[PDB]
Design a protein around this nucleic acid. Sequence first.
RNA 1: GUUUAACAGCCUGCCCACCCUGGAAACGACUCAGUCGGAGGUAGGGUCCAGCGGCUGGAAGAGCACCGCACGUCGCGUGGU
Length: 97
Amino acid sequence: SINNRLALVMKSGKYSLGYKTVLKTLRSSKGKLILISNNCPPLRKSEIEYYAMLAKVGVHHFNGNNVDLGTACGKYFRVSCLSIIDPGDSDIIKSLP
RNA sequence: GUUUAACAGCCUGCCCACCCUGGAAACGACUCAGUCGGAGGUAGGGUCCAGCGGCUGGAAGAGCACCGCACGUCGCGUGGU
Ligand SMILES: [K+]
Ligand SMILES: [Mg+2]
């Protein structure tokens, strides 16, 4: 399940939550996978997709809104998008492709 | 009774709004009340907006108060604080 893998990444991996940090990781090429929620504004989603295409980074469309993504990440706030800098014990980067 | 107009310049910069750095749970900030924050808070530094705000020019030469000299019939006279 995507949620279980995300929880495993949260408890054992490196990540950044938020649009600005996601763009920073994409610019720095440190991010390896970008997750975008349905709630994400269309323009922001398009910009993130363009950045990921430029950086050759996979993009996954989370099956939920920002509230659901934040809940899956274990946080009490909304998460519009997140970047997986390093999956510790998970294999999302390997399973998704 | 012990005053300072329009207008010109400089300064200031309410409550908001906005920008840059950064990335937050042991959640924090915060109002009389609320509310705000990974759609980026707290924090640090800035931009802008109001003013019937400040200083200067206008403008002390004016106005007001007080104290005097003089013509003493007609100087709307003359001086000081
Ligand atoms: K006027
Ligand atoms: Mg005088």
